[PDB]
Amino acid sequence: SELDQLRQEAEQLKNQIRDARKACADATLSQITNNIDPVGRIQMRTRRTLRGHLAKIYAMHWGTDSRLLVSASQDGKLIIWDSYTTNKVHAIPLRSSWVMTCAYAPSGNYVACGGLDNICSIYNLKTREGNVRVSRELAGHTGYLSCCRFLDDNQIVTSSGDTTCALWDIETGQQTTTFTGHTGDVMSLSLAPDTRLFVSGACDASAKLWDVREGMCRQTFTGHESDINAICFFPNGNAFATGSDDATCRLFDLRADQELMTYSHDNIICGITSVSFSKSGRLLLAGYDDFNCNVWDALKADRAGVLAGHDNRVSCLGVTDDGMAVATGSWDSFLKIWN
């Protein structure tokens, strides 16, 4: 039939892609990195505890100044903190209690958040009057908002449980591009350093590389055996890491078009909730449902350290742009800055 041919040629193209990928697999990253010294033991202390949320924390995002951060909570608020003094700059109660994500505009002028309301709300931080007010409610997804990241003050990418991501024009309130392809809830996204590309991780156990301008999917990356809950780009933009419900993180190279490494331990059986790289890319920090953040050697795959300071799930984390600190957020309602 017609569906007979399409289906068998699509499976034939998949073998072709797999064949081409294997043709590139001439050496591994672990072989290539055998001669560089181990990282040794990464031991950080808690420098700040950020106290204030009255319930579980679901997300956090650092400011580009490496000082202010926004966090979102089960208590139905965003709090913006000064990590240096621990003082709250703003505490923003939300219209929906079911918030799940937040984001800080690179300029520092806006934050965004959303969740089960299926809306990405934008909050103007520096109102002409002086207040913090909701400046735009981006409606359009037909499922929960899982992640959102600003490109500038008038563009944001969002991911959703409706299995799509989208680019928005904030002024018009309209989706400029819709990114369709995932066959499961999209759980996380990460913008490439240039913001021409981004990657998403879904409950279909795959990650995808999207062209923001053209709006198409360029590459699809498989390997994980369960939900990808978290994704992050390597600092130079040519690879990214994912963290999954299968208790592994993995490194994927965009130009070799395949997985380079797996970060796992037989000890570690719980899911990963958050991933982030250190400034140089050498450390991969991942947050776990066993209350820890494990620090991996991105090049050699050994675990370099543990940040063990929360009494429930580490639900989110982020390294500052200046490299100075990691923030971990938790179901215990605290954020801690480690250094």
Partner: protein
């Protein structure tokens, strides 16, 4: 059903026809990136309390 399967065929066509580099090149570039920025990474190369805003800067 039939529109969907053609849609998937054309996507896989796009994905299949791209230029790939050897994992040895890819891996070498990542390693080289890390070595170049190793000393500018404070979580790797711990800074003096003086330079640390969470201690004594």
């Amino acid at each position: 059903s039939i529109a969907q399967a053609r849609k998937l065929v054309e996507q896989l066509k796009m994905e299949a026809n791209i230029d790939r580099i050897k994992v040895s090149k890819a891996a070498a570039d990542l390693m080289a990136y890390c070595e170049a920025h190793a000393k500018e990474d404070p979580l790797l190369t711990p800074v003096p309390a003086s330079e640390n805003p969470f201690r004594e800067k």
